[PDB]
Every structure is written in C-alpha cells, then in structure tokens.
C-alpha cells in the first residue's frame, strides 16, 4: 500500500497516490469496470427474478429490462413481453464477465507492477507525454466507434430495435434505410435546446437514430486514427493544461454534461425510450388525460369543438400560439408532444376534430387511459400519485428515477470538474499548496484603492 508520510496525501485522498502508479492505476480502473459490469449483470438477474408478466415493466420498477426490450429482445406486437430468457442471458453474461475484469483489476492492484513504463513500454505512459496520451485516446475512440456500429448492425441485421412508431402497430423493425443526410443528422445538433426544437431530444424516427450512430461511429474511429497518428498542435499545447488531474477534469466536465442530456432524453424522448416499457412521459400523461375526458364527454354528448371553458379558451381543444389546433387546458404547454397513439388523429394543422369525432380507435383510448393513470408523478417512498394522495398505489415512473438520478450525477460530476480543473491549473502554476509567505503576489501588485 502507501502512507501519507511518503505521498503527502491523506487516506481520504489515497486514490490520488495512484496518479504516477500506472500499473496500480490500471488495476483500479479495471476493477471499477468489474463493479459496473457486476451491477449490470446482478441487477438484470434481480429484475428478471422480480419480473411478473401480468404487469408492464414500468409498473414493476424495472430500469435495465426496458433497455434490452428497446434493443428488440423478448418483445412482441404492442410491446407485449413474449419471453424473458434473453434478459436472463444478458445478466448471466455480464455477471460472469465482471469476474474476469475483477480478477484483472485485483492482479494489477496487488501482484501486477505499480508502474508499466519500465517493463511494458506500450502500456507505459507519463502524463504530459501528449503523443502517448493522444494515442491512448485514439485506441478508446476507435473502441466507442465499434460499439456504436454494433448497435447499427443490430438495427439493420441480427434482428432489429423495437419501433414504437412502426406502421400498422408498434413492434421491432429492422432499419433498412438509416438517415445518412448530414443536414438531417447534424440538424439536431444546431437545433435550439428550447421548446419545439428540443435539440437532439427531438429525434422521433429510428432511421435518424441509427443513421446518427453511423455518423458518430465513423467519426470516432477516424478521430481515433487521427489522434493515434497526430500530436497536439502548438495552439492546443498553449491553451490546455497537460496533467492527469487536468485530463480527468476534462472528462468530468464532459461526462457531467452527458448526464444532464441523458436526464432530458429519459424525461422527454419517447422513441429511444419506448413509453411501452419506460411508461408515459410527463407531457404524454397530460395529453392522455385531456384525450381521455374529451373522448368520454364526447360519447356522453358534448361538442368538444364548440365547448368554451371557464376562461373562454376552449375546454377540450384550442389553438397553439403558432396556430396548430391543440388540446385545451394547462396541457397547452405540452402542445409540442408527439406520441404514436395521437399522431394518427393529427393532421397538417394540429389535431383533426374529424378523427376526434369519428375514427378514434379503441387502442388510442385504452393506451391514453393507461398512460394517464401511470403518470411520472410519484413520491420517494414510491407512493404513486400526483400529490396529496393516500398511500394506495406503489409506483414511481422509471423515467422519473433515471431523470432525477442522472441529473444529480451530472451536477456532482460538474462540481468535480470545477474542483479537479481548478486544482490542476493551480498545481501547474505551483500555488496549489498555498502562498509562498515570501513571494505573495498581492504584496507586489498595485495598492488598488
């Protein structure tokens, strides 16, 4: 092990004693991967064991199974779960794989050499050695590109991902014409993050998703080769801190942003996160309620078209500021919502009361009714309900869990970026420990006021 007397780092900063220990650092990272793979496998098998075919996955508080279901495994027409053995296979595979990674980490943390540069030059690396650092980034960049292409392969081959917008009903579909038009693929990137544009969260077609992964997959592999055969340019070296903590701070900041984006994706996107498995989105639940009553009242004998509300802005239907006909009520804020159950009734100009008056299919109703009841609203003790509700329902939208968890994760990792980045910059300057007590810069600065 190590002691503070020889490192200057206390036990609460012990892992910081592994910065220059390449061999030990390898074991630490490899081991941590084992933990991640372990949970993926363990929790998956736990979910499979606690899964029941009489209830939707979202009602069973399952988060991992929805991911496999979206990949198009053990799912059928309407999102109905045919079998769960595929899910069991995934858990078993990850769990056993975690053992291999665990052994490697333990070895590279005990028997393995504390450093590798002395023995294995290829693995041997020193922070600041930009060339080597860029090469390492390249290798991992290629790996991520291959992973994205594996998804693209599963979409156009080896079966297909589940398409909630599939024609004549939602089910797994083999993407055959993935969007490769740069304008469409990169359009999302330049889209405003505000309402309507929804930036990249707006992606509603699997064709763009698979096509976008095609673009990112290629660029990452090409970028890896570039970083493998190129060294940072003068401008970069003069505008970046070359240190392990600095490199970590860059990753911390990036992963923190990715966390926030993932939170929004799980809360707004319904394509990449099928509402059939992940449950309805906040906007989806609201629109579903308006549709549920609109249908019920219309059947009772109410003209939803000319039904003035208390404010006079239409009880069931109204016009979006843009002009599109939208459901009335506070759901006006979610007028930009788009779901496979509501699209058929829509048309060039907002909703089509013709479809609403006649052509409303029973499933369009049943689905909306189910979504309305299973809204994302919930409590920490898992007491399902808008609020001020009695303890009767035990359900919290999986979307809520992912959105809340990843948001908090992103926030902390951003704070970690600020901590590591600032310390890295201060370390480079040399004032990380504190003031010289003899070269205090302020004492040499202008007396200001």
């Amino acid at each position: 092990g190590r002691d503070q007397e020889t490192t200057g780092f206390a036990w609460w900063s012990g892992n910081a004693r592994l910065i220059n220990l390449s061999g030990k650092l390898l074991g630490a990272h490899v081991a941590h991967a084992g933990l991640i793979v372990f949970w993926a496998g363990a929790m998956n098998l736990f979910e499979v064991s606690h899964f029941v075919p009489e209830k939707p996955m979202y009602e069973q508080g399952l988060i991992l199974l929805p991911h496999i279901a979206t990949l198009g495994y053990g799912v059928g027409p309407g999102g109905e779960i045919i079998d769960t053995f595929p899910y069991f296979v995934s858990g078993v595979l990850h769990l056993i794989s975690s053992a291999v990674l665990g052994f490697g980490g333990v070895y590279h943390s005990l028997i393995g050499p504390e450093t590798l540069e002395e023995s294995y030059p290829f693995f041997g690396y020193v922070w600041k050695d930009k060339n080597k650092m860029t090469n390492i980034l390249g290798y991992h960049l290629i790996m991520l590109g291959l992973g994205a292409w594996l998804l693209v392969w599963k979409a156009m081959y080896f079966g297909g991902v589940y398409d909630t917008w599939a024609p004549g009903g939602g089910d797994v579909r083999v993407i055959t014409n993935p969007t490769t038009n740069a304008a469409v693929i990169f359009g999302y990137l330049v889209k405003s993050p505000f309402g309507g544009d929804g930036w990249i969260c707006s992606v509603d077609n699997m064709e763009d998703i698979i096509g976008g992964h095609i673009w990112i997959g290629t660029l990452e592999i090409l970028g890896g080769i570039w970083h493998i055969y190129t060294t940072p340019w003068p401008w970069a070296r003069r505008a970046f801190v070359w240190s392990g903590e600095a490199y970590l701070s860059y990753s911390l900041g990036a992963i923190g942003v990715m966390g926030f984006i993932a939170c929004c994706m799980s809360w707004f996107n319904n394509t990449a996160y099928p509402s059939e498995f992940y449950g309805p989105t906040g906007p989806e639940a609201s629109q579903s309620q308006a549709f549920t009553f609109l249908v019920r009242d219309q059947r009772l004998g109410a003209n939803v078209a000319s039904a003035q509300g208390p404010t006079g802005l239409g009880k069931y239907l109204m016009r979006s500021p843009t002009g599109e006909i939208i459901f009335g009520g506070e759901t006006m804020r979610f007028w930009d919502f788009r779901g496979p159950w509501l699209e058929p009734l829509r048309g060039p100009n907002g909703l089509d009361l013709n479809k609403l008056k006649n052509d409303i299919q029973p499933w369009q109703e049943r689905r909306a009714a189910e979504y309305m009841t299973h809204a994302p609203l919930g409590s920490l003790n898992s007491v399902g309900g808008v609020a001020t509700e009695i303890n009767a329902v035990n359900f919290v939208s999986p979307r809520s869990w992912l959105a809340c968890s990843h948001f908090c994760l992103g926030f902390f990792f951003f704070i970690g970026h600020l901590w590591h980045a600032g310390r890295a910059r201060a370390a480079a300057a040399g004032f990380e420990k504190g003031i010289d007590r003899f070269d205090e810069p302020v004492l040499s600065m202008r007396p200001l006021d």
């Binding site: 939170c263 809360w267 906040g282 639940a285 609201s286 309620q289 308006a290 009553f293 509300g309 208390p310 404010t311 009880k315 069931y316 009335g328 009520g329 506070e330 759901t331 804020r333 979610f334 309305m372 809204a375 994302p376 609203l377 919930g378 409590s379 920490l380 003790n381 007491v383 309900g385 808008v386 609020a387 001020t388 509700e389 009695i390 303890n391 009767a392 919290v396 939208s397 979307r399 809520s400 869990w401 959105a403 809340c404 948001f407 908090c408 926030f411």
Partner: protein, 55 residues
Amino acid sequence: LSTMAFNLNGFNFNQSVVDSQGRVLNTWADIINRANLGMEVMHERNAHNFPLDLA
C-alpha cells in the same frame, strides 16, 4: 428541488397508520396533507379543466 422538478415528491405517509379493522388513524402527516389539498384546490382557480394536475 431538481428531483422534485421531475415529479419525485417527498415522503408520502398519508393513511400509513391503520387500526385492526382497517380504520385509518390520522397522523401529523395527514394534517399536513389537509393543508396541501387546500393550496392545491386554490392554485390556478381557472387554469384547470381536468381533475388530475399531471402538468
């Protein structure tokens, strides 16, 4: 506050204490709920056309 922004409300122990036959024994939490109901039924007096405030 951010988690509650995703509809993750705080602990809900409404009607958590029940007697032998099933009668609900109210608690301080239930009293807090009574107030919450009052604020809810009042907020946006004319901005709700449906019962559930999913929004």
